[PDB]
Design a protein around this ligand. Structure first.
Ligand SMILES: NNNc1ccc(NCCOCCN[C@H]2C[C@](O)(CO)[C@@H](O)[C@H](O)[C@H]2O)c([N+](=O)[O-])c1
Ligand SMILES: [Ca+2]
Ligand SMILES: [Ca+2]
Lengths: 105, 82, 152, 597
């Protein structure tokens, strides 16, 4: 699936092949993160370790369900981290399909 | 002086139609929009009279056919009682 | 509840590739010999240790206590997309200064402080501090992945 | 030791990330706002109540709905026209049988001082008789496939093509299409709803456009996907501005959005369901949107899918009345649920919710002016206002409006009470219904009935209201203000009030507006200018002051620049410590002070 790729019955000719980009960020002192809408999920974002990452890809999901990280209609790639001591934000300015993993330690 | 129709107070006559609601039943402001439970009487000369909510006095909408509910709103209402 | 209509991460081939990369020693490293402090930015070459792919890190301190990190290919076969019309202005920059250096590290000061950026050379890493408090790290878990444009 | 790690994985483009260092969350708001802009200031009418459904039948149905609100004394600013108003989902058209005279309908609504919203989707029916399709085809403004042909997918009108909104020439075309000469039957009180703009493609992968479709400049659809909807929203809003000659502020609702969409209007959470858990989730969904700059957020009141039971509809109106975008909307096969079709006890609680919302419009307007100027969210999680109270870091059945109002709507069937967390060390909170004061921090058990909306005003704040609720906000926008002063334990309070003409850019191009500061300390209420550049001709005056937490004074004195010193009559309730100052009568543009002797 690295180049030409099919999903169900639809074919992506992917003429440029794999071009994805990724990067991680560590937030010492932070236990609570928020943002990256739109998801039918809690205000405080959940860890994605045992499941799916949060998906940012504007999609029309018929009769969408609650408490899951499926991508809904809008995507704002902005994450806020809050603690007693400080507030931080990350703004990932990318317009392509984006997945976001969150892990606590 | 003037006393409310429900006896909740008694006020000088300069507090009748003074654009502030002083009676619980709204009876001190029959000509303004100041009371939430008041009524404005459309005389509609020559035709059927009508009562409207005080909140529709000078709201810019023609509620009476004679247009007398809009006298200081910037909306000029024509007489349509015909 | 039939969600087979929509891809999981595993069914997305770029998500499956990226997520298979797990926390560890990053193969990227900054070439401090290529370091250049420009008017608006610091630029330095990065390299993938195995594939020898060359990237360009463009680091910027910004007014209002912000940092912007941009990474692109040094010699791309074709231009990569940069999101237009979302930013309302070209963000006003603040001057970076080298305020510390060793063989594997370059410390950068944003204007006159208190914000600093530590660029580690090998492995590539970014740390952001206010004075001596570590605020945030970049690529600390070694998950940076940049698939360069191959022959179409 | 505690630490959170975040990993971003994107299909293409460069790495481009902004690190926003605070240190406070309001520093983060300002930082992000300086990058992507702030919430567009909504025209006042769009902060009122919107009545919508899929679909109102014809012009007669629209006018009956309009008359229904007045006959049942319920306020409403906008009635919405979904896709069945067009000719077979050819957008910018009107069904020739059911909407044959749109100008007359719009004129009838204008005479009631109400607006209309029409849906315009970005998919264009492939139809050689459809002038929109012919022009976009002839000018090559459609998204293309790799072989150079125009992309064709499926949507509401069947086979449809997708304009390339990433092309600036396409967006200018779209914007010009909203001129009153091009969009025949449109009028100044007609606004726009952009839907399906992800773009939704029924026969496409994941119900959207193929990754390898080609846009302006040769970029693939995989490169641009998440800003496609934003470009639709932007081009539409520019079109509503241009059609007025650059004078009128737009109102556009959009379903798809991106960073920066706050500059172009409102969004809503799409097709929710008439269920209690969907009611609950509207708070965290709109709160997560507020945190990232999208303050003009809401969810379909009553749920889009299925039929809500009357109790659920009541609670949804009460919830929606305290959320920024306030629209009831419903699926084609649902029963009609205009609020006067319910039994009287449910009608009465819904009307009460509508009155509270309309009374609070001056407050809502000022919060949106602050969002517009500073980038601060209107709707806020409790932890934004109490960043050191760790027990608030996850709260999502409660929210704040600005710093002044704490809201805990009932979101459970048959509830006998709610548990309200009132935060803050040395903080007091006033139940705005009973005026009972409560000290924080505590979790209060508050009994509720069907008509209860748990709302508390924070000590130290001043909230402006229009207590004269009329049929729409245009009818109210010259009315006098009542000020609600909630005294802190130190006997102090402050608040702001923004005013303008309610719908133009004159506040910005001509500095025609008022920004007033109200402040209480010692025993004196003072009004001063919070921005001297703003001047406004307005008949608005101060008709009443309600002070919570005050003792009985011996006399009340008002001083106004240009006027002799005056005495005010007052009423005091010793049980609730509520003081009501009668008819100060001072212009809202005037400096003045009231002293409690
Ligand atoms: N042409 N193909 N036929 C066909 C007929 C029916 C359906 N059922 C989908 C029902 O979901 C509606 C999605 N809701 C959208 C749109 C609005 O409903 C009307 O504009 C608006 O009210 C909503 O607010 C907005 O969110 C489908 N199909 O593919 O699902 C295909
Ligand atoms: Ca009176
Ligand atoms: Ca009237």
């Amino acid at each position: 699936g690295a180049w030409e790729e099919t999903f169900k019955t639809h074919s992506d000719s992917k003429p440029y092949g794999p071009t994805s980009v990724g990067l991680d960020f560590s937030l010492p002192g932070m236990e609570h993160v928020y943002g990256i809408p739109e998801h039918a999920d809690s205000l405080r974002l959940k860890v994605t370790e045992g499941g799916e990452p949060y998906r940012l890809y504007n999609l029309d999901v018929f009769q969408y369900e609650l408490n899951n990280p499926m991508a809904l209609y809008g995507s704002v790639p902005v994450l806020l981290a809050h603690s007693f001591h400080r507030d931080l934000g990350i703004f990932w300015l990318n317009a392509a399909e984006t997945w976001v993993d969150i892990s606590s330690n | 002086p003037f006393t409310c129709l429900d006896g909740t107070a008694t006020i000088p006559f300069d507090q009748v139609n003074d654009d502030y609601c002083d009676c619980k039943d709204g009876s001190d402001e029959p000509g303004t929009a100041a009371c939430p439970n008041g009524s404005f009487h459309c005389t509609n000369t020559g035709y059927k009279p009508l009562y409207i909510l005080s909140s529709r006095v000078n709201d810019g909408v023609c509620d009476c056919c004679d247009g007398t509910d809009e006298y200081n709103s910037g909306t000029v209402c024509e007489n349509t009682c015909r | 509840v039939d969600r087979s209509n929509f891809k999981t991460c595993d069914e997305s081939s770029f998500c499956k590739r990226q997520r298979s990369i797990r926390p560890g020693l990053s193969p990227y490293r900054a070439l401090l010999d290529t370091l250049q402090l420009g008017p608006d930015a610091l630029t330095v070459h990065l390299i993938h240790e195995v594939t020898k792919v060359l990237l360009v890190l463009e680091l910027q301190g910004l007014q209002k206590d912000m940092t912007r990190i941009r990474i692109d290919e040094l010699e791309p076969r074709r231009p990569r997309y940069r999101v237009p019309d979302v930013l309302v202005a070209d963000p006003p920059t603040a001057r970076l200064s080298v305020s510390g250096r060793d063989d594997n590290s370059v410390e950068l000061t944003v204007a006159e402080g208190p914000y600093k950026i530590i660029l580690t050379a090998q492995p590539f890493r970014l740390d952001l501090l206010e004075d001596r408090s570590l605020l945030l790290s970049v690529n600390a878990r070694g998950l940076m992945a940049f698939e360069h444009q191959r022959a179409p | 030791t505690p630490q959170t790690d975040i990993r971003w994985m994107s299909e293409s483009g460069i790495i481009d990330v902004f690190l926003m260092l605070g240190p406070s969350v309001f520093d983060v708001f300002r930082q992000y706002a300086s990058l992507t802009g702030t919430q567009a200031l909504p025209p006042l009418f769009s902060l009122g109540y919107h009545q919508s459904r899929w679909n109102y039948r014809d012009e007669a149905d629209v006018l009956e709905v309009d008359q229904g609100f007045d006959d049942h004394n319920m306020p409403c600013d906008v009635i919405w026209l979904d896709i069945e108003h067009a000719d077979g989902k050819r957008y910018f058209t009107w069904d020739p049988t059911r909407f044959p005279q749109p100008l007359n309908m719009l004129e009838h609504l204008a005479s009631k001082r109400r607006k209309l919203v029409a849906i315009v989707d970005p998919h264009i029916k492939v139809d050689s008789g459809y002038r929109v399709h012919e022009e976009l085809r002839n000018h090559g403004l459609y998204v293309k496939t790799r072989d150079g042909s125009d992309y064709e997918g499926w949507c509401w009108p069947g086979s449809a093509s997708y304009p390339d909104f990433t092309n600036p020439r396409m967006r200018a075309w779209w914007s010009n299409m909203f001129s009153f000469d091009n969009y025949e039957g449109s009028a100044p009180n007609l606004y726009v709803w952009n839907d399906m703009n992800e773009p939704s493609v029924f026969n496409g992968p994941e119900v959207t456009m193929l990754k390898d479709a080609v846009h302006y400049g040769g970029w693939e659809h995989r490169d641009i996907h998440n800003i496609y909807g934003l470009y639709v929203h932007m081009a539409t809003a520019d079109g509503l501005i241009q059609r007025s000659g650059g004078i009128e502020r737009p109102f556009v609702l959009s379903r798809a959005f991106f960073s920066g969409s706050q500059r172009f209007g409102a969004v809503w959470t799409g097709d929710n369901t008439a269920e209690w858990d969907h009611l609950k989730i509207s708070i965290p969904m709109c709160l997560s949107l507020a945190l990232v700059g999208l303050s003009f957020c809401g969810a379909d009141v009553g749920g889009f899918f299925k039929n809500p039971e009357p109790e659920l509809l009541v609670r949804w109106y009460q919830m929606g009345a305290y959320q920024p975008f306030f629209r009831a909307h419903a699926h084609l096969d649902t029963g009609r649920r205009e609020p006067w079709l319910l039994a009287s006890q449910y009608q009465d609680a819904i009307r009460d919710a509508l009155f509270q919302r309309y009374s609070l419009l001056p407050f809502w307007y000022t919060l949106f002016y602050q969002a517009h100027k500073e980038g601060f969210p209107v709707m806020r999680p409790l932890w934004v206002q109490y960043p050191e109270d760790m027990s608030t870091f996850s709260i999502e059945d409660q929210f704040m409006l600005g710093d002044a109002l704490l809201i805990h709507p009932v979101s459970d069937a048959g509830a006998h009470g709610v548990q309200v967390y009132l935060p803050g060390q040395e903080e007091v909170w006033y139940d705005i219904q009973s005026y009972q004061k409560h000290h924080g921090p505590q979790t209060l058990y508050l009994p509720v009935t069907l008509s209860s909306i748990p709302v508390f005003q924070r000590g130290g704040t001043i909230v402006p209201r229009w207590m004269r609720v009329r049929r729409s906000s245009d009818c109210m926008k010259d009315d006098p203000i009542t000020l609600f002063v909630a005294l802190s334990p130190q006997g102090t309070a402050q608040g702001e009030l923004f005013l303008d003409d309610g719908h133009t850019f004159n506040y910005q191009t001509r500095h025609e507006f008022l920004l007033r500061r109200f402040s209480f300390s010692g025993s004196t209420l003072v009004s001063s200018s919070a921005d001297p550049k703003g001047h406004l001709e307005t008949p608005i005056w101060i008709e009443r002051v309600v002070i919570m937490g005050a003792g009985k004074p011996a006399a009340v004195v008002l001083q106004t620049k240009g006027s002799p010193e005056s005495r005010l009559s007052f009423q005091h309730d010793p049980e609730t410590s509520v003081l009501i100052l009668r008819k100060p009568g001072v212009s809202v543009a005037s400096d003045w002070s009231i002293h409690l002797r």
